Design a protein around this ligand. Structure first.
Ligand SMILES: *CC(=N)NCCC[C@H](NC(=O)c1ccccc1)C(N)=O
Ligand code: NA
Ligand code: NA
Length: 420
């Protein structure tokens, strides 16, 4: 059964889907095509949930026959009621400066095996688990990694014995959420999950579903796009709002960001699918955008597609870069950046660098950042003239072999500012 615990030792920071992932969780019997599992296993660890050793063996046979990369296949043996790992598996958060933890909750469906699964997930991964006493579902949750979370109104109505203030306080305590952005669902379906209409693509980018002008939900979705366009994101700029046009209820926002790859469910027609994939390519330079056809037995639905049947797993030894960039018109006279770098692997960090380019000319140059205090690094851009345009990103490495950049994708999408 659900076990309430004290929240994690602070400060707490929920991890975003576009941060480093060590694995992806899927479940058998399958709700996803074998081609998706094969694609995932090329570069990432795929953890398949099975109910028994016999089911594990059945799945290994199927993976071997389909040419899945077995060297990237792991298994968790636990009973589950469904393949919606997005919704019932635990949520990841950093706490106590450099630890990765799992947050359990009361799954909002009558699925006791699914509801119990986070306990087996935490034990499998070797991390601590915290029990947040809220009725929740992962499909109705997304965080920017900077203390904001977007959820539809069911986060309140399915916790109606608690005040909104108490619900917000639990999200703050267990996940570090300082802006619990609870919105009226615009999609007109029974499910009321954010992932069927909205997705943070980066701290400063949000993808919102779009439908034809004559569709009954056209204005609700246009209103939702305007709502985020007027908001200041974690980096201090207004959100970049991208739109994926669903001409016929195609679940284009129901994608999975896994490290440098994005898996987008497609169900036709080809031209409309390709238009949606091109939105992701424009929004996410440097990422590999992959269109994924559905399984014939369990097709993608407008209320249930690829994101709904997967869940990313954070790196328990995460090399985390905390950075608030300097963007747009910078008054100066100083152009100083700061980054906090912590290793959840308790690995020795070196080097910490700033990669930069001036007036988009030549190649990116590397400069060492100064460690001013433990985990706190700084860099000042010197010799810059009026109207100089700077491109930069942060890079860190540690002695466990981890290598991370901020932004995650690095060089293909750097921070940009102009000297005033
Ligand atoms: C999109 C997401 N994060 N989750 C989708 C969960 C779909 C699931 N569907 C059903 O329960 C269902 C059963 C039988 C027929 C149709 C739908 C759910 N709502 O939990
Ligand atoms: Na079942
Ligand atoms: Na649970």
């Amino acid at each position: 059964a659900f076990q309430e615990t004290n929240p994690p030792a602070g400060p707490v920071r929920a991890i975003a889907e576009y941060e480093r992932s060590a694995a992806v969780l899927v479940r058998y019997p399958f709700g996803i095509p074998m081609e998706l599992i094969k694609e995932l296993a090329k570069n990432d660890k795929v953890i398949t949930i099975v109910a028994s050793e016999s089911q594990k063996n059945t799945v290994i046979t199927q993976y071997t026959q389909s040419g899945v990369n077995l060297s990237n296949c792991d298994f968790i043996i636990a009973k589950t009621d469904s393949y919606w790992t997005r919704d019932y598996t635990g949520w990841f958060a950093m706490y106590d400066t450099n630890k990765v933890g799992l947050v359990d909750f009361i799954y909002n469906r009558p699925r006791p095996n699914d509801d119990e699964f986070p306990k087996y997930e935490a034990q499998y991964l070797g991390i601590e688990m915290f029990g947040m006493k809220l009725k929740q579902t992962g499909g109705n949750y997304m965080t920017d990694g900077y203390g904001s979370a977007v959820q539809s109104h069911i986060a309140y109505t399915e916790n109606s014995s608690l005040s909104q203030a108490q619900v917000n306080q639990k999200m703050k305590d267990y996940l570090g959420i300082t802006h619990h952005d609870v919105v009226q669902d615009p999609n007109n379906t029974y499910i009321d999950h954010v992932d069927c209409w909205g997705k943070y693509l980066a701290p400063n980018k949000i993808l919102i579903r779009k439908v034809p002008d004559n569709h009954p939900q056209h204005q609700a979705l246009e209103d939702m796009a305007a709502y985020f366009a007027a908001q200041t994101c974690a980096w201090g700029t207004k959100y970049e709002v991208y739109r994926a046009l669903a001409t016929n209820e195609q679940p284009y926002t129901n994608s999975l960001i896994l490290n440098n790859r994005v898996f987008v469910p497609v169900n036709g027609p080809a031209s409309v699918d390709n238009d949606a994939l091109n939105v992701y390519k424009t929004a996410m330079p440097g990422y590999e955008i992959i269109g994924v056809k559905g399984a014939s037995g369990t097709p993608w639905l407008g209320t249930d597609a690829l994101h709904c049947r997967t869940h990313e797993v954070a790196d328990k030894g995460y090399l985390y870069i905390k950075h608030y960039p300097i963007l747009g018109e910078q008054a100066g006279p100083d152009y100083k950046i700061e980054a906090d770098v912590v290793s959840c692997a308790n690995a020795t960090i070196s080097p910490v660098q700033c990669y930069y380019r001036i007036n988009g000319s030549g190649s990116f140059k590397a400069a060492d950042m100064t460690m001013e205090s433990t985990g706190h690094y700084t860099y000042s851009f010197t010799g810059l003239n009026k109207n100089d345009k700077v491109e930069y990103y942060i890079s860190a490495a540690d002695n466990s072999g981890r290598k991370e950049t901020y932004p995650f994708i690095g060089e293909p999408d750097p921070f940009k500012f102009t000297c005033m």
